[PDB]
Amino acid sequence: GLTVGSLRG
Amino acid sequence: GLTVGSLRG
Amino acid sequence: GLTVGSLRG
Amino acid sequence: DFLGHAENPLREEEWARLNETVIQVARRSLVGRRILDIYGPLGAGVQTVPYDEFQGVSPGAVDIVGEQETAMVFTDARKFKTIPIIYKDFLLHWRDIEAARTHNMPLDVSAAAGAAALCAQQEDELIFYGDARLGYEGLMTANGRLTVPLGDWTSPGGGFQAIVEATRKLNEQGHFGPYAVVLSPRLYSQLHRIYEKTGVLEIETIRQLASDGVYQSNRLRGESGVVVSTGRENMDLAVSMDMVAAYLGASRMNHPFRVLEALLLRIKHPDAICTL
Amino acid sequence: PDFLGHAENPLREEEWARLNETVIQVARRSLVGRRILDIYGPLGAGVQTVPYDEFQGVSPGAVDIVGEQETAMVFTDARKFKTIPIIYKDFLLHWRDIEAARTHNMPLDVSAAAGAAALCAQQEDELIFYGDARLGYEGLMTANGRLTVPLGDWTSPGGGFQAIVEATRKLNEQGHFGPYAVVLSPRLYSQLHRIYEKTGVLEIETIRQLASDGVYQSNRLRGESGVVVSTGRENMDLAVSMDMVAAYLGASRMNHPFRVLEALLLRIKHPDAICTLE
Amino acid sequence: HAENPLREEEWARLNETVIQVARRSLVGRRILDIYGPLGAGVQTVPYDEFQGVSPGAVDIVGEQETAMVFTDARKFKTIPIIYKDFLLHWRDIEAARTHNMPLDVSAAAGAAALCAQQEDELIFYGDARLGYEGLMTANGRLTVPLGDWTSPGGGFQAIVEATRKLNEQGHFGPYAVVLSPRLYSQLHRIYEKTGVLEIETIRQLASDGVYQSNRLRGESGVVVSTGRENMDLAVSMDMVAAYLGASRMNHPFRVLEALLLRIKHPDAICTLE
Numbered sequence: 001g002l003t004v005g006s007l008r009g
Numbered sequence: 010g011l012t013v014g015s016l017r018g
Numbered sequence: 019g020l021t022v023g024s025l026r027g
Numbered sequence: 028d029f030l031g032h033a034e035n036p037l038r039e040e041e042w043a044r045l046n047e048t049v050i051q052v053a054r055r056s057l058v059g060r061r062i063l064d065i066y067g068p069l070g071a072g073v074q075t076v077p078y079d080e081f082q083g084v085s086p087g088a089v090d091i092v093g094e095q096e097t098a099m100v101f102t103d104a105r106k107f108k109t110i111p112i113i114y115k116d117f118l119l120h121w122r123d124i125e126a127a128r129t130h131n132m133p134l135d136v137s138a139a140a141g142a143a144a145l146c147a148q149q150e151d152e153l154i155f156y157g158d159a160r161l162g163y164e165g166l167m168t169a170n171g172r173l174t175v176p177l178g179d180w181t182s183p184g185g186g187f188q189a190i191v192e193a194t195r196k197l198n199e200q201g202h203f204g205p206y207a208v209v210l211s212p213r214l215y216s217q218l219h220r221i222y223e224k225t226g227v228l229e230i231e232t233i234r235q236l237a238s239d240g241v242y243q244s245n246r247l248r249g250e251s252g253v254v255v256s257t258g259r260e261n262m263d264l265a266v267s268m269d270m271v272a273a274y275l276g277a278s279r280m281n282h283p284f285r286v287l288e289a290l291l292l293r294i295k296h297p298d299a300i301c302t303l
Numbered sequence: 304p305d306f307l308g309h310a311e312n313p314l315r316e317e318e319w320a321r322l323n324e325t326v327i328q329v330a331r332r333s334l335v336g337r338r339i340l341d342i343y344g345p346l347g348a349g350v351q352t353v354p355y356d357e358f359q360g361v362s363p364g365a366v367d368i369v370g371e372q373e374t375a376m377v378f379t380d381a382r383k384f385k386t387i388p389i390i391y392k393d394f395l396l397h398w399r400d401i402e403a404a405r406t407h408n409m410p411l412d413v414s415a416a417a418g419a420a421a422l423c424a425q426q427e428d429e430l431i432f433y434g435d436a437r438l439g440y441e442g443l444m445t446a447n448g449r450l451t452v453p454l455g456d457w458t459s460p461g462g463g464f465q466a467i468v469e470a471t472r473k474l475n476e477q478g479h480f481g482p483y484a485v486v487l488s489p490r491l492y493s494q495l496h497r498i499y500e501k502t503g504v505l506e507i508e509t510i511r512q513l514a515s516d517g518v519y520q521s522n523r524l525r526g527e528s529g530v531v532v533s534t535g536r537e538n539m540d541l542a543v544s545m546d547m548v549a550a551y552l553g554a555s556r557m558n559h560p561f562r563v564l565e566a567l568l569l570r571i572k573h574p575d576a577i578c579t580l581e
Numbered sequence: 582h583a584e585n586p587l588r589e590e591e592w593a594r595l596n597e598t599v600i601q602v603a604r605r606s607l608v609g610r611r612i613l614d615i616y617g618p619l620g621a622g623v624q625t626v627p628y629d630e631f632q633g634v635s636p637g638a639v640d641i642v643g644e645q646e647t648a649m650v651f652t653d654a655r656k657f658k659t660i661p662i663i664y665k666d667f668l669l670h671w672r673d674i675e676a677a678r679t680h681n682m683p684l685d686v687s688a689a690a691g692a693a694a695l696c697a698q699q700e701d702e703l704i705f706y707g708d709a710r711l712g713y714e715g716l717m718t719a720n721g722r723l724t725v726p727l728g729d730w731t732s733p734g735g736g737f738q739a740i741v742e743a744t745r746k747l748n749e750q751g752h753f754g755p756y757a758v759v760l761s762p763r764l765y766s767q768l769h770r771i772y773e774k775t776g777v778l779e780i781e782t783i784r785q786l787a788s789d790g791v792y793q794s795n796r797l798r799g800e801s802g803v804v805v806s807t808g809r810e811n812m813d814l815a816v817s818m819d820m821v822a823a824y825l826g827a828s829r830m831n832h833p834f835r836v837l838e839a840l841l842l843r844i845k846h847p848d849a850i851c852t853l854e
Contacts, residue, residue: 001618003596003819004603004838007610009790011068012046012269013053013288016060019345021323021546022330022565025337026534034582072676112672120369276582276827279370285830289672352625352657384625384659 029121029280036124036274036282041134045272048136049286052143053270058244059154062207063292064259069110069267071289076265078106079295082171084201110267111161113149114287117142121280139272142286146270151246154264154292155209155253166209166253166262169297173197177250177303180214183223190236193254193301200298202256207239210252215243254301261299266290305398305557312551313401313559318411322549325413326420326563330547333424335521336431336443339484340569341536346387346544348566353542355383358572361478377537387544388438390426391564394419398557416549416563423547423563428523431541431569432486432530441571443486443530443539448574450474451581454527457494463506467513470531470578479533479576484516486532488524491580529580538576543567586674586824586832591684595822598686599693599836603820606697608794609704609716612757612807613842616815619660621839626815628658629845632721634751660817661711663699664837667692671830689822692836696820701796704814704842705759705803714844716759716803716812721847723747724854727800730764733779734772740783743804743851750848752806755789760802764853765793802853811849815841 037045069076081099088095117138127134157165164170175192179185194206210218218230218241226232233241239257247253255262268289275283294300304310314322346353356379365372394415404411433442441447452469455462471483487495495507495518511518516534524530532539545566552560571577587595616626635648667688677684707713714720725742729735744756760768765780768791772779784791789807797803805812817839825833844850 001620001819002615002816003600003821004607004610005819006615007604007607008614009611010269011065011266012271013050013057013060014269015065016054016057017062017064019347019543019546020342021327021548022334022337023546024342025331025334026339026341034584070675070679071672072678072680074672074676122369273830274582275830279373281369281371351627382659384657386655386657 029125032277034274034276036119036121036277037134041127044134045136045139045284048140049143049270049272052140053147056144056147057151058209058242058246059151059292060264061240061242062209062255062257063154063262063264064257066259066263066265066293068269069265071268073110073267074289075107075109076267076291076293078108078293080106081296082298086201108163108291108293109161110265110289110291111153111158111163112287112289113146113153114285115142115145115149116275116283116285119282119284121277121282124282139284139286142284143270146286146288148246150288150290151244153290155244155246156248157292163292164294164297165292166255166294166300167247167251167302169294169300171297173200173298173301175301175303177214177252180217180250183220183229184225186214186218186229187223187232187236189252189303190233190254193303194236196301197254197256197299202261202296202299204256204258204261204299205239206237207242207255207257208233208237208252209242209244209247209255211247211250212243212245213250214252215241251303256296256299261296262292262294264290265293305402308557309553313396313398313554314411314551318401318404319549321411322413322416322561325416326547326549329417329420330424333421334428335486335519335523336428336569337541338517338519339486339532339534340431340539340541343540343542343570345546346542348545350387350544351566352384352386353544353568353570355385355570356572357381357383357574358537360575385440385568385570386438387542387566387568388430388435388440389564389566390423390430391562392419392422392426393552393560393562396559396561398554398559401559416561419561419563420547423565425523427565427567428521430567432521432523440568441574442569443532443571443577444524444528444579446571446574446577449577449579450477450575451579454491454529454580457491457527460499460502460506463491463495464509466529466580467510467531470580471513474531474533474576474578477575479538479573481533481535481538482516483514484532484534485510485514485518485529486521486524487518487529487580488527489520489522490527491529492518492520531578531580533573533576538573540570540572541567542570582827584824586669586671586827591674591677592822594684595686595689595834598689599820599822602690602693603697606694607701608759608792609701609842610814611790611792612759612805613704613812613814614807614809616813616843618819619815619817621818623817624660624839625657626660626841626843627652628656628843630654630656631846632848658713658841658843659711660815660839660841661703661708661713662837662839663696663703664835665692665695665699666825666833666835669832669834671827671832674832689834689836692834693820696836696838698796700820700838700840701794703840705794705796706798707842713842715842716805716844716850717797717801717852719844719847719850723750723848723851725851727764727802727853730767730800733770734782736764736768737772737779737782737786739802739853740786740804743853744786746851747804747806747849752811752846752849755807756787757789757805757807758783758787758791758802759794759797759805760791760853761797761800762793762795763800764802765791804851804853806846806849808849811844811846813843813845815843817841
């Protein structure tokens with residue numbers, strides 16, 4: 001359900 | 010299209 | 019749930 | 028049902044009756060469309076139209092070999108103008124719609140007729156006097172307007188003298204065309220006198236002069252009038268959207284609508300207009 | 304069976320039913336706050352947090368032919384979320400009592416369950432009337448924003464009536480004129496039942512006629528103290544995520560510890576629907 | 582008055598505009614792990630604090646007693662909605678469907694940029710009205726001074742002292758450094774004689790990245806021991822455009838996300854003050 005999401009890295 | 014239309018003529 | 023329940027009525 | 032935020036509270040027959048009521052009231056109360064040609068329905072997405080403005084008349088050529096340059100100069104930064112939305116809102120009570128479905132039946136659309144009449148009066152106000160904050164020129168407010176004096180219409184024949192002076196000043200700018208006269212209701216009522224005494228009611232003589240028509244507009248303020256040289260090249264009405272009713276969604280369980288149109292007056296030749 | 308130590312379940316379904324019936328019966332006899340409070344219903348044990356809406360004042364409705372008069376919306380004034388505590392008491396069942404119930408004494412002896420259920424009910428009423436004061440809960444007697452009338456001379460024949468009438472008058476002028484309930488400490492409650500010289504009528508009868516939702520005695524209320532509450536939903540509420548139930552704690556020294564527990568929170572939506580007698 | 586004024590291509594264009602602006606803008610999401618999409622119905626999360634550090638090792642042949650690792654005080658925090666609303670004109674939509682085509686979504690880009698900078702502001706300097714603590718405002722914070730950052734190395738020495746303090750609190754491993762743009766621009770200078778810039782010396786000291794954030798105020802920075810165990814981004818719903826229903830035939834939308842920053846260890850944050 002993420003749109004931007006995780007930006008880790 | 011036109012609904013009231015031209016009333017000129 | 020509502021084992022004891024409401025005692026108001 | 029009425030509980031709930033339902034789009035389209037009206038049936039197809041009620042929508043058709045609402046729309047045709049709007050059309051009949053607009054055809055009854057629009058004077059600007061009697062004297063102006065329509066550039067044609069551009070679609071509601073067209074928001075801007077070219078505003079070509081011509082300052083002089085350049086006549087045709089007659090010669091054996093057609094080597095004369097005979098076009099308008101078409102210079103100096105061709106303008107565009109935004110087509111405004113002209114609109115009035117009306118309200119239907121939800122219990123009237125619920126009565127139309129079960130109890131006493133015919134849905135009254137008199138508020139639609141009132142809003143259509145006010146949208147038509149706003150269109151005629153835009154045609155004759157423009158809009159200051161949006162920068163629109165009307166027929167009575169166009170810059171360079173050939174104005175004649177309005178002299179003593181309380182005597183019969185003063186109206187005829189005013190219209191022949193107006194058409195003479197229009198003749199001087201090369202606008203020879205079939206004229207239209209729009210007057211205020213005071214001036215139009217003063218033309219309805221048989222006391223011209225060279226004949227018949229003075230408005231018949233004006234109707235021979237004009238030949239595109241003599242009209243009332245109650246938008247015309249005081250004792251005032253306008254004589255225009257009609258035709259698409261002088262002025263028209265750029266109608267991107269003709270007059271229509273749109274649902275706005277329920278506000279307080281009641282049903283508001285908008286009678287709206289999107290049109291702009293394009294004065295291409297301001298010297299084809301003469302006021303008073 | 305009993306030699307396998309940590310069995311997951313030491314009771315049969317009928318013994319669980321007897322245990323839970325005992326808990327329900329003792330809690331129904333013991334609880335005072337649930338007679339004046341509606342229940343925001345069973346949220347489930349996995350719901351640990353409840354909305355805590357607070358409403359400041361009442362705005363009137365509208366009378367209109369077409370419904371266009373634009374009255375204000377009741378939504379909340381300050382949305383908070385408040386965690387639902389666990390209210391519990393432990394009891395012990397001796398394992399040979401379960402074995403004897405399976406052989407001799409066929410209904411299981413649940414006296415420790417009944418005592419624990421009474422103590423859990425007492426803790427629920429203690430959280431309803433006073434707060435927790437460590438976990439940031441407000442009781443009916445400790446709600447900031449409540450009203451207060453002075454507790455006059457209740458030894459005189461008519462002081463309790465004057466205090467309750469003034470309390471309902473102050474509740475009425477805050478827009479809370481509904482069925483009132485009065486919860487008194489046992490001292491004031493017994494004082495309302497007194498027969499003086501040429502009494503005529505007990506003061507508790509007048510208070511019971513004025514407080515339509517009942518006049519109650521709670522031993523959790525301390526000293527000479529009491530409370531009048533406009534009793535409905537939209538004033539106050541009991542958010543119950545899990546009602547009173549017995550849970551097995553796993554065996555210790557072959558005996559069976561259980562816990563009677565509930566998870567509930569008192570939600571005071573309108574604090575000015577409370578008038579404490581102070 | 583529809584429930585949907587946009588076609589699916591227009592919705593896709595609007596949403597990828599919002600996602601592109603957010604992914605280009607967000608800096609807090611580069612250093613914080615996510616607690617998943619919780620769903621819009623989840624509007625409250627546990628806020629564990631873990632400030633107690635009992636030696637913890639049983640360290641016996643058998644089992645002696647140490648205190649269990651738990652929340653020192655179990656509390657919950659409400660997830661705020663971060664939102665910015667924008668308006669599309671209806672004749673613009675009708676023009677995009679018939680006349681000049683592409684359906685300008687510049688208002689969506691501006692709203693998504695404002696919503697992303699509000700998310701970053703909530704992450705670094707949390708809402709004091711709503712009781713949220715940011716990374717720069719968390720009570721229980723390690724704090725090292727900047728010292729002289731206008732030297733050959735003053736930035737690297739501040740990161741060295743910050744990582745020393747974080748190591749002495751038992752917070753190790755990949756560090757992430759977020760600097761204000763003044764400090765981040767200062768560090769593209771020569772410090773060590775091999776010609777490596779001071780930013781890259783810090784980048785081999787801070788393994789999970791050195792970032793700049795325009796929401797950081799003045800000369801300021803933060804070093805974080807990154808990881809889900811130390812701090813978290815509880816996302817109820819990620820950034821999305823919602824239609825609000827037609828008003829005067831125009832189409833108001835809102836870009837919104839629901840998220841909260843959970844500092845589970847306020848010893849894993851050292852601010853460069």
